Amino acid sequence: SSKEVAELKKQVESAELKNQRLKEVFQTKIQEFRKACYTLTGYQIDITTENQYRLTSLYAEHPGDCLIFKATSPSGSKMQLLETEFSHTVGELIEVHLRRQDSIPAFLSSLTLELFSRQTVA
Amino acid sequence: SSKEVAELKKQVESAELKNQRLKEVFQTKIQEFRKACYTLTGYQIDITTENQYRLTSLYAEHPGDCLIFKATSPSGSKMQLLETEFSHTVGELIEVHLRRQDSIPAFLSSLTLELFSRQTVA
Amino acid sequence: SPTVHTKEALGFIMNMFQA
Amino acid sequence: SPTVHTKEALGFIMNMFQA
């Protein structure tokens, strides 16, 4: 019918519009967030196709090196660190903090502080 | 019914579903990014009603000890730390890492460790 | 002011960034 | 595979987590 046709057309417009609305806010909101966690925690967190987390420090000595954490994570479990070129360099640290203390946050924090100290004018 | 109307009904459903499926994906993903951010950095980043950032250590003495940051400028990547009840207890850490050195990373990093130190290991 | 879908959208996501 | 809507949707989101 003429009423049905026109009545339905509005639904499509609205839904299509919602899709556009949804994407814009979400894109904008997510981008702003990630900046906060970088600016704040001094780690950029990148998801890989494999849902593994790659962290690159703000104070990283080299652009190329970074850390990658992978999780079995069906649930919110604890991740296990996968070896990277950078990861080998910072031995001990891991022993002290991950192997022994078992706290990823302590490891990063320690690492972050360490990197800062190295960062020097000359 | 009408071939014209049928198309709209099918069109509508997909579009509703497309938004529908899309919203679901964020749920899984957003949580998955946060919990990773949380277990790794040892901080839960929440965005307030006033679009301020509220941080809470995985090692918090009591719950509701949080910290709040507000972006000074939307464009400018630097955030002021707002006074809060828990902020009072870290006069020291603030003095050293936030003004003397102007580094949230340093500041949080060094805090995460102090709080991690006060964990009854009984 | 604020459009409806946007308002609707905004609330859904803002909820997704708490507890 | 996966249904199409989830698929395009999924792709859209994943690209956001990048530099």
> Which among A45, A98, A101, A76 is positioned nearest to B41, based on CA atoms?
A45
| Same domain assignment for residues B52 and B33 | no
Name subunits touching D (3+ CB pairs < 8 A).
Answer: A, B
> With contact defined as beta carbons under 8 Å apart, do B38 and B44 qualify?
yes
CA atoms of B108 and B55, how far apart (whole Å)? 10
Cα→Cα distances B84→B81, B91, B96, B111, Å: 9, 11, 18, 15
Same structural domain for residues A19 and A59?
A: no
Q: Which residues of A touch D19 (CB under 8 A)?
A: 44, 46
CA–CA gap between residue A104 and residue A100 (Å, rounded): 11
Tell me if A109 and B113 make a contact (CB, 8 A cut-off).
yes
> Is the Cβ–Cβ distance between A28 and A14 less than 8 Å?
no
Amino acid at site A38? Y
Residue B106: exposed, middle, or buried by beta-carbon count in 10 A (0-12, 13-18, 19+)? Answer: buried
- Partners of A80 in beta bridges: A70
Task: Please choose, from the candidates B41, B59, B23, B35, the residue with its C-alpha nearest in 3D space to the C-alpha of residue B104.
Answer: B41
Terminal alpha carbon distance of chain D:
29
The answer to whether residues A37 and A54 belong to one domain is no
A102 with A61, same domain: the answer is: yes
**Maximum C-alpha span of chain A:** 79
Which of A18, A25, A37 is best to mutate for the C interface (most C CBs within 10 A)?
Answer: A25
Q: Are residue B73 and residue B111 in the same domain, yes or no? A: yes
8 A C-beta contact, residue A68 and residue A53: yes
Provide the pairing of β-strand B79-82 with A67-70: unpaired
CB atoms within 10 A of CB C17: 17
Which of A11, A26, A41 lies at the terminal end of a domain, its last residue?
A41
DSSP B45-85: EEE-TTS-EEEEETT-SSTT--EEEEESSSSS--EEEEP-H
| Domain of residue A34, residue span | 1-41
Residues B9 and B48 in one domain: no
A65 and A105 in a common domain: yes
**Torsion angle of the four alpha carbons D13, B21, C6, B10, in this order, in degrees rounded to the nearest 10:** 130
Domain count for chain B, please give it: 2
Domain co-membership, B67 together with B104: yes
The answer to whether A13 and A5 are in contact (CB under 8 A) is no
CB contact at 8 A, A14 and C5: yes
Say which of C12, C13, C17 has its CB closest to residue B46: C17
Query: Would you tell me how many other CB atoms lie within 10 Å of the CB of residue A33?
Result: 18
d(CA B114, CA A35): 25
- H or E element that contains A54: strand A53-57
Residue B106 has, within 13 A of its CA and on its CB side, a CA count of 18
Experimentally determined by: X-ray
Tell me: do B22 and B65 sit in the same domain: no
